[PDB]
Write a protein that binds this ligand. Structure first.
Ligand SMILES: Nc1ncnc2c1ncn2[C@@H]1O[C@H](COP(=O)(O)OP(=O)(O)OP(=O)(O)O)[C@@H](O)[C@H]1O
Ligand SMILES: [Ca+2]
Ligand SMILES: [Ca+2]
Ligand SMILES: [Ca+2]
Ligand SMILES: [Mg+2]
Length: 431
């Protein structure tokens, strides 16, 4: 059955004649313009090796240069070849569109074989040279891997996904020969697994590490999060166990009427709430690490204060950001135990006892203790206190935003916000 599903899978991963139409057109036009400027360039794209996934067409033309400043000479070439130009972020490249297709124009050094400069963009040409001859013919094998990963939300190395980059996908296919062979062997992958392509071997190491043929110190799966690696391995065991075209299909968002969520949550008996604030104007690769950090800090705070957090999640929309939380403790006693000094310490004892308190401190196991009052008794109130005076620990941009404004939302109001998918996923809700 397997080989019959992978066959139907191809119709989901391979590009349709009208998009492979935009590709060829743009490429032809783009070279024309680039040749008229007499520029030294090379298509290093997934497009350049026909390995790009259905519906994800994009070109990456790298301009080759020596010297030091190629920031402006590129600004020129780019702005002069792209019908429309924008500028993403020694970093600055030109993202435009040409004949309707997204085009990245990056400047690098035509290098005399290895030993780059503040290496980063300069390796890309080599990555391309190393993959071009070895991946020929296995294009679709690659499109299967990616299509497989994308359907399960773990394709892409950007911080929002922390999954499998494309390069990685192609290295893996070169190493094993085919999608199927990849999944079959991926079932035995561990967190200490090292896939060294250059030496055609697999050994044990400190962490999952796919060595880059071009640079043996660079881990091509650096951004792949442990959990996503663990998710791929599991998906692989699950696919072999019972292959199905549904693995190459995107899962459908849980349609949840706000009243069925309130039911699940009262049934779980937990405290569900979110921290809402204005999304700062920063790029995803900057925002996401901050949203993860913030979510972690507030979670650790919740642990410390004993509200026993179960799990957290975050969500970024167009205007706002939410840090979702679920704690097992909805309310905690006002009173708590303050550890005092050892009965021996005559001074720290006189000091500890001079403070006025509603109740009398006591000795337990040779040490003084005192009952005091918390300044909050619910995880929601605690977070309001924390987000109010410790916003500086939630990331430079997020923290700053939460400092200006934010609100703790729970109940139905929380359900009205666009965090349902995340909410459900966080609590492990099913169909
Ligand atoms: N070092 C690089 N190696 C390969 N592709 C690169 C590199 N740098 C930029 N790219 C581009 O990144 C985009 C993402 O895909 P990638 O190149 O990783 O190949 P892929 O994953 O096999 O193809 P696709 O991403 O379309 O599924 C493509 O447009 C590709 O040209
Ligand atoms: Ca994600
Ligand atoms: Ca994910
Ligand atoms: Ca209260
Ligand atoms: Mg690109």
């Amino acid at each position: 059955k397997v080989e019959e599903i992978l066959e139907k899978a191809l119709e989901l991963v391979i590009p349709d004649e009208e998009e492979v139409r935009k590709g060829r057109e743009a490429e032809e036009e783009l070279r024309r313009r680039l040749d008229e400027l007499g520029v030294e360039y090379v298509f290093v794209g997934s497009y350049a090796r026909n390995t790009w996934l259905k519906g994800s067409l994009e070109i990456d033309v790298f301009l080759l240069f020596p010297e030091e400043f190629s920031k402006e000479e590129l600004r020129e070439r780019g702005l002069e070849i792209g019908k429309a130009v924008l500028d993403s972020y020694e970093h600055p490249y030109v993202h435009g569109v040409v004949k309707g297709v997204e085009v990245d124009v990056v400047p690098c050094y035509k290098l005399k074989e290895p030993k780059n400069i503040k290496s980063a963009v300069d390796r890309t040409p080599f990555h391309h040279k190393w993959l071009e001859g070895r991946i020929k013919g296995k294009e679709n094998e690659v499109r299967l891997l990616k299509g497989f990963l994308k359907a399960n939300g773990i394709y892409g190395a950007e911080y929002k996904v922390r999954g499998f980059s494309g390069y990685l996908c192609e290295l893996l296919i070169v190493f094993y020969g085919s999608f199927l062979e990849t999944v079959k062997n991926a079932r035995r992958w561990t967190r200490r697994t090292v896939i060294d392509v250059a030496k055609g071997e697999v050994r044990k190491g400190e962490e999952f590490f796919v060595v880059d043929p071009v640079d043996e110190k660079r881990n091509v799966a650096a951004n792949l999060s442990l959990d996503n690696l663990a998710r791929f391995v599991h998906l692989c065991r699950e696919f072999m166990e019972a292959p199905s075209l549904g693995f190459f299909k995107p899962k459908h968002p849980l349609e949840i009427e706000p009243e069925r969520l309130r039911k699940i949550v009262e049934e779980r008996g937990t405290a569900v709430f979110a921290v809402k604030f204005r999304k700062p104007d920063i790029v995803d690769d900057n925002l996401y690490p901050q949203l993860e950090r913030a979510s972690r800090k507030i979670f650790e705070f919740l642990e410390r204060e004993n509200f026993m957090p179960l799990r957290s999640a975050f969500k970024a929309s167009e205007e706002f950001c939410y840090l979702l939380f679920e704690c097992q403790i909805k309310e905690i006693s006002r009173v708590f135990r303050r550890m005092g000094p050892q009965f021996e310490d005559e001074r720290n004892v006189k000091k500890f006892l001079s403070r006025n308190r509603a109740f009398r401190p006591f000795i337990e196991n040779g040490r003084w203790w005192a009952f005091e009052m918390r300044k909050f008794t619910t995880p929601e109130e605690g977070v309001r206190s924390y987000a109010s005076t410790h916003w500086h620990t939630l990331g430079k941009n997020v923290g700053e935003s939460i400092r200006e404004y934010f609100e703790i939302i729970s109940g139905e109001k929380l359900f009205k916000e666009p965090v349902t998918a995340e909410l459900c996923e966080m609590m492990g809700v099913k169909d």
